[PDB]
């Protein structure tokens, strides 16, 4: 896994997988 949820310590093997993980940290609307 490149990429690492930091903050609840979920990680991904997708780099949207976990763009999509990151819009939910940070709210888009
Ligand atoms: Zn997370």
């Not at 690492?4 to 949207?16: G, I, N, V, Y």
Request: glycine letters at 0%.
């Amino acid at each position: 896994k490149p990429f690492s949820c930091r903050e609840c310590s979920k990680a991904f093997s997708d780099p949207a997988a976990c763009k999509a993980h990151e819009k939910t940290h940070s709210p888009l609307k």
